[PDB]
UniProtKB/Swiss-Prot annotation, chain A:
Name of the protein: Spike glycoprotein
Fusion peptide as annotated region, ranges: 159-179
Protein localization: Virion membrane; Host endoplasmic reticulum-Golgi intermediate compartment membrane
Gene from which the chain derives: S
Disulfide-bonded cysteines: 14-36, 19-25, 121-132
Subunit structure: Homotrimer. During virus morphogenesis, found in a complex with M proteins. Interacts with host ACE2.
Swiss-Prot record, chains D, E:
UniProt domain comment: The KxHxx motif seems to function as an ER retrieval signal.
Organism: Human coronavirus NL63
Function: S1 region attaches the virion to the cell membrane by interacting with host ACE2, initiating the infection. Binding to the receptor probably induces conformational changes in the S glycoprotein unmasking the fusion peptide and activating membranes fusion. S2 region belongs to the class I viral fusion protein. Under the current model, the protein has at least 3 conformational states: pre-fusion native state, pre-hairpin intermediate state, and post-fusion hairpin state.
PTM: Glycosylated by host with heterogeneous N-linked glycans protruding from the trimer surface. Highly glycosylated by host, occluding many regions across the surface of the protein.
Protein name: Spike glycoprotein
Coiled coil: 1-42
Description of how the protein assembles with itself and partners: Homotrimer. During virus morphogenesis, found in a complex with M proteins. Interacts with host ACE2.
Localization in the cell: Virion membrane; Host endoplasmic reticulum-Golgi intermediate compartment membrane
UniProt family annotation: Belongs to the alphacoronaviruses spike protein family.
Length: 194, 339, 97, 49, 49
């Protein structure tokens, strides 16, 4: 099942979109000084409110994170879900083995809403891209809060919480036993051998 | 006074004193720019048109009306163009009496009913036929003529009658360049005012080398140019505007930092970082350990330095399981209230 | 536990009341009693813990710590005795129940 | 993703429509008429945008 | 409360913008032109409002 939790923030510029950098519009927009003063803030207020709520749910745990390894899941081959550990960079955890297959499908075809870099739209030497074609009209796309790392620290702290039984400080019960406690909820198992 | 880098933000937003937060800033500058012109191939042919006006004064009263005024086009009463380029002027003769007694009288053209202006006809405006004249003919707009003594009392003296018809054959020229065989011009590497294949705007034109076959004009989906191509060769060119907006942060009636897109210093700030998708320019230290402002994925603190945002710590213990081991069961309790 | 309601500008303001643990206790749990190697007993309700400290057996909950004494009305017959049980003969069953 | 793309594609496409004026590019309006007559044309685009 | 206030503050502020007419006050329009010519002006404000 799929659910949507956030969208992309858009911040627009009044004086550039209204007219392309002519130094004569600004003598006429002064009479409309309250016309678009109420647009930039009306957008940036919601853009700021979104991050105060998205970042309030993405918690993180340290002990439960360390139990997300493939060696602590019995004989259930779940290795295509757990996050990848080493990327040879300054990242604690990267995308999982399944998220890459999802991102290979659609997001590469957006071309105008994801991880655009504005360091290249001001050097020429090539025909402007679609993303840089809108930056000349004042439309800017802010980066999101949930990057590749935080989503790999919040999800991994939930996947690793299943094997964390009610033992002492940091003991981990085998995963073959974590289902015996979730089956007695339905009906009491009266078979000695599993 | 609008001189200081911070005194301009107030001077731009029409406000005495500003709040705290992020503000948009893009300071334009009025100046004079060179002009470039590129058009489809055609030969060159020119003509010149004067517009003179002589006068005499002193009949019975001076400040009332001039004694006599003459209007003539090149000495004729009607002259028009069979050629492909033209340019028109306006000449007032002040050496009528030898001694320049015309110092008091000011004579100039007004704005008539035509949908253009006399002083902007020399620009790259395109028509089919014009046929100026100094006498009344049916179906023709006109420019009045005015005479005044030290700007006290105005009066109307004569007029200039002009006809036209929409077309794409006759083009005006600022001045008659002589010795050329195909009128063209191109200025590179800094801002100009181009007129390229019936496109008007501003920007910087640079050279490049790309392998593309097809059209000679690549426009965006909003009517703006992005690059054209010289027809007698294969080289193309790139056109970009030369004023990009920025984002300024204001805190305690001062500028803390900015997030520009140009790799250089900015409005009074010196240091320069390099974020994954833009540049950051500030002049603070790197020892701040606090936060006062928040943005997408980082927090600008009091002096300008950047500080990454950290997640929230929270630990939990899972459900108990049926096993012969040592368990932990809560013993003492306390209460709390949430809203 | 409970909640309280109060009014506000065109809306309501709730006041929840919850509990939070402070101290924990360590318990030596078990998993059932196997008498004479073949007959076995387990707790019927899946929310009870059978444990024994220094020779005495008691039954408590899993959410709070409310010890009491075990009674025969809490055990069912789970025959064939998984190995990790308590070894005890039927002549001495009264010392645990 | 398609719905997100289409919203911006529609916004950036309304600069082509010149309103009841001479043209949709302001540098052309200020290149033909004088200063006293271009102010009645520029505002027609300003109000639409 | 801020959002509720801003909506009315925006609605009451659109009476200032005169459309393609002489002025933004109808009494001024009827004070200058005659009856046969002010009807082509008043409707330009009526349709906008
Ligand atoms: C209606 O008329 C239209 C106008 O003419 C016409 O569209 C045009 O179609 C031609 C097809 O011939 C396009 O030609 C370009 O040719 C480039 C040169 O390479 C090819 O052409 C040579 C001569 O024909 C061949 O000899 C050559 O083979 C040689 O080279 C090979 C490689 O070196 C070598 O392996 C061979 O052995 C041999 O030695 C080769 O066949 C070519 O580079 C160019 O590439 C386009 O396609 C590539 C793949 O998609 C892209 O990587 C490249 O960037 C170009 O794609 C762009 O344009 C596409 C169509 O518009 C878009 O779908 C792409 O996304 C991309 O658009 C981006 O870039 C644009 C600027 O380029 C930009 O404006 C966009 O916004 C976007 O950012 C291409 O094949 C010619 O380019 C077409 N015109 C335009 C304007 O694109 C159309 O076909 C006619 N309609 C019908 C029904 O016929
Ligand atoms: C489009 O336009 C852009 C710019 O507008 C072009 O970019 C420039 O292209 C020039 C070449 O056309 C580049 O010139 C290089 O100059 C180097 C020496 O310069 C140094 O010294 C001078 C003083 O003498 C100094 O002023 C300067 O600053 C430098 O310090 C040359 O060494 C170099 O040639 C080298 O490479 C070529 C082939 O290059 C191959 O590999 C490239 C990647 O490395 C690849 O991009 C190429 O396409 C190509 O596949 C090679 O032939 C040279 O010598 C070999 O052959 C000899 C035998 O003849 C053999 O003895 C030797 O051992 C080598 O095997 C040499 O290795 C360049 O000529 C200039 O630097 C570029 N500018 C920039 C900013 O990049 C661009 O080329 C144009 N075209 C395209 C398609 O983009
Ligand atoms: C945004 O813009 C900023 C600029 O504001 C960019 O930052 C600079 O980026 C440069 C390239 O990325 C950095 O490297 C410098 O490059 C200079 C130019 O060389 C290039 O261009 C020439 C053509 O002009 C080309 O031929 C060449 O191949 C390069 O491509 C270099 O001059 C400069 O050298 C500096 O340092 C040396 C000594 O450095 C050595 O010794 C140091 C200890 O002293 C040691 O720490 C170093 O690691 C190194 O081992 C110095 O000799 C140079 O010249 C000085 O001395 C001579 C006399 O000796 C004197 O005549 C001269 O005037 C100088 O005083 C020179 O100082 C670098 O290699 C550069 O470091 C960046 N600048 C800063 C402040 O970080 C930025 O890259 C841009 N961003 C983007 C994305 O493009
Ligand atoms: C469930 O709970 C019950 C009770 O609630 C647990 O029963 C208790 O389990 C404890 C184990 O943690 C027992 O403590 C051990 O006591 C040993 C001594 O007992 C002997 O003597 C008594 C009489 O006094 C006698 O009755 C008994 O039968 C024995 O003969 C200690 O030796 C032992 O210490 C061991 O562990 C420490 C740990 O030190 C650090 O090192 C760890 C890494 O190895 C580190 O991870 C730890 O965190 C810790 O910081 C170690 O230092 C000791 O080393 C000594 O000995 C070596 C030689 O072996 C020597 O070289 C070195 O210098 C030291 O001198 C040693 O290895 C325990 O403290 C306790 O007695 C039990 N009590 C009861 C009533 O049963 C039960 O275990 C729990 N079950 C589970 C699964 O958790
Ligand atoms: C789930 O749990 C598993 C648990 O196994 C975990 O996998 C382990 O992950 C850790 C990551 O921390 C790995 O630890 C790494 O070890 C590297 C050392 O191994 C390399 O170097 C060996 C030679 O080093 C010897 O000699 C030097 C002196 O030169 C000495 O200091 C060393 O201590 C050591 O004695 C080399 O033999 C070895 O090659 C083995 O493997 C190959 C196949 O790959 C095989 O062909 C060989 O025959 C040999 O068996 C290997 O090349 C170490 O480099 C690395 O980082 C250290 O060094 C850097 C500097 O480079 C330091 O900055 C850093 O702090 C470290 O000190 C790291 O410590 C461990 O190897 C994994 N084990 C296994 C079995 O995979 C998973 O990650 C867990 N999963 C999740 C999701 O968490
Ligand atoms: C704006 O345009 C107007 C229109 O052109 C222009 O007015 C001309 O101004 C020039 C300036 O000098 C005049 O040029 C002179 O012309 C003399 C010939 O004049 C003829 O007409 C005389 C009568 O005309 C007046 O009276 C009638 C009413 O009767 C009135 O409607 C007219 O408007 C005008 O006011 C007439 O008397 C005269 O007769 C002379 O010549 C005959 C021989 O032909 C002789 O027999 C007579 O006895 C008498 O002498 C003639 O018929 C001309 O003589 C004069 O010559 C000068 O130069 C010579 C050297 O070559 C000198 O030796 C001599 O002394 C003179 O200085 C001169 O050329 C022209 O006549 C005006 N046009 C008209 C229609 O009158 C304005 O100037 C323009 N505005 C400005 C600022 O310049
Ligand atoms: C990054 O940021 C951090 C923090 O922002 C920064 O740490 C600062 O470092 C600078 C320079 O190293 C410190 O400035 C110096 O402070 C010296 C004294 O500080 C120590 O002593 C304090 C008490 O001393 C007073 O009282 C005693 C009697 O009790 C008396 O004898 C002394 O003379 C003096 O009057 C002590 O409270 C303080 O501890 C701080 O930190 C702890 C936590 O570690 C905290 O719990 C405390 O409450 C307190 O905040 C500290 O241990 C001072 O002597 C020295 O003076 C020099 O300069 C003057 C000119 O100004 C000269 O005249 C003089 O001769 C000396 O040359 C100087 O002022 C500053 O105090 C630190 N700030 C903090 C908060 O610790 C790092 O340096 C930054 N950079 C890096 C790379 O980390
Ligand atoms: C004022 O004086 C002027 C000339 O002194 C009179 O008008 C002109 O008189 C000259 C005489 O040489 C004629 O050639 C012109 O044709 C006259 N001009 C006009 C327009 O008739 C004028 O009549 C005098 N009286 C006034 C102006 O009331």
């Amino acid at each position: 099942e799929y659910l949507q939790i956030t969208s992309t923030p858009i911040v627009v510029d009044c004086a550039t979109y209204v007219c392309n950098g002519n130094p004569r519009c600004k003598n006429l927009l002064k009479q409309y000084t309250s016309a678009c003063k109420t647009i930039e803030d009306a957008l940036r207020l919601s853009a700021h409110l979104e991050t105060n709520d998205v970042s309030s749910m993405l918690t993180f745990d340290s002990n439960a994170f360390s139990l997300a390894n493939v060696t602590s899941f019995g004989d259930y081959n779940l290795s295509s879900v757990l996050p990848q550990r080493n990327i040879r960079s300054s990242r604690i955890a990267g995308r999982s083995a399944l998220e890459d297959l999802l991102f290979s499908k659609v997001v590469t075809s957006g071309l105008g809403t994801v991880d655009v870099d504005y360091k290249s739209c001001t050097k020429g030497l090539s025909i402007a891209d679609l993303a840089c074609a809108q930056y000349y009209n004042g439309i800017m796309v802010l980066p999101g809060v949930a990057d590749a790392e935080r989503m790999a620290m919040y999800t991994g702290s939930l996947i690793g919480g299943m094997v964390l039984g009610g033992l002492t400080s940091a003991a981990a019960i085998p995963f073959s036993l974590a289902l015996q406690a979730r089956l007695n909820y339905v009906a009491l198992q009266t078979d000695v051998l599993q | 006074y609008c001189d200081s880098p911070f005194e301009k933000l107030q001077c731009e937003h029409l406000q005495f004193g500003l709040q705290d937060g992020f503000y948009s800033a893009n300071f334009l500058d009025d100046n004079v720019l060179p002009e470039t012109y590129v058009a489809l191939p055609i030969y060159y042919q020119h003509t010149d048109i004067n517009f003179t006006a002589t006068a005499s004064f002193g009949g019975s009263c001076y400040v009332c009306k001039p004694h006599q005024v003459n209007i003539s086009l090149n000495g004729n009463t009607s002259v028009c163009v069979r050629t492909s380029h033209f340019s028109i002027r306006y000449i007032y003769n002040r050496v009528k009496s030898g001694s320049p007694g015309d110092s008091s009288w000011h004579i100039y053209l007004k704005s008539g009913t035509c949908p253009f202006s006399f002083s902007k006809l020399n620009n790259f405006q395109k028509f089919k036929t014009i046929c100026f004249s100094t006498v009344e003919v049916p179906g023709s707009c006109n420019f009045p003529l005015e005479a005044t003594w030290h700007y006290t009392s105005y009066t109307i003296v004569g007029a200039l009658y002009v006809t036209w018809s929409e077309g794409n054959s006759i083009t005006g020229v600022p001045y008659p360049v002589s010795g050329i065989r195909e009128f063209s011009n191109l200025v590179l590497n800094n801002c100009t005012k181009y007129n390229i294949y019936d496109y008007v705007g501003t920007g910087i034109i640079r050279s490049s080398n790309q392998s593309l076959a097809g059209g000679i004009t690549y426009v965006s989906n909003s009517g703006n140019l992005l690059g054209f191509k010289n027809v007698s060769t294969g080289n193309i060119f790139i056109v970009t505007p030369c004023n990009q907006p920025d984002q300024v942060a204001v805190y305690q009636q001062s500028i803390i930092g900015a997030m520009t897109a140009v790799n250089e210093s900015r409005y009074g700030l010196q240091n320069l970082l390099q974020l994954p998708n833009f540049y950051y320019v500030s002049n603070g230290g790197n020892n701040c350990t606090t936060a006062v402002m928040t943005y997408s994925n980082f927090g600008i603190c009091a002096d300008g330095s950047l500080i990454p945002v950290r997640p929230r710590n929270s630990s939990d213990n899972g459900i108990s399981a049926i096993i012969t081991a040592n368990l932990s069961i809560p013993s003492n309790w306390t209460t709390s209230v949430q809203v | 536990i409970f909640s309280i309601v109060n009014s506000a500008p065109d809306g309501l303001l709730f006041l929840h009341t919850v509990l939070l643990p402070t101290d924990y206790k360590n318990v030596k749990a078990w998993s059932g009693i196997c008498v004479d190697g073949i007959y076995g007993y387990v707790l019927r309700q899946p929310n009870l813990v059978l444990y024994s400290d220094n020779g005495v057996f008691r039954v408590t909950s899993r959410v709070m710590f409310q010890p009491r004494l075990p009674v025969l009305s809490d055990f069912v017959q789970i025959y064939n005795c998984n190995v990790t049980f308590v070894n005890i003969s039927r002549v001495e069953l009264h010392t645990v129940i | 993703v398609n719905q997100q793309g289409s919203a911006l594609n529609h916004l950036t496409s309304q600069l082509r429509h010149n309103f009841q004026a001479i043209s949709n590019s302001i540098q052309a309006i200020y290149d033909r008429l004088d200063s006293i007559q271009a102010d009645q044309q520029v505002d027609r685009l300003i109000t639409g945008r």
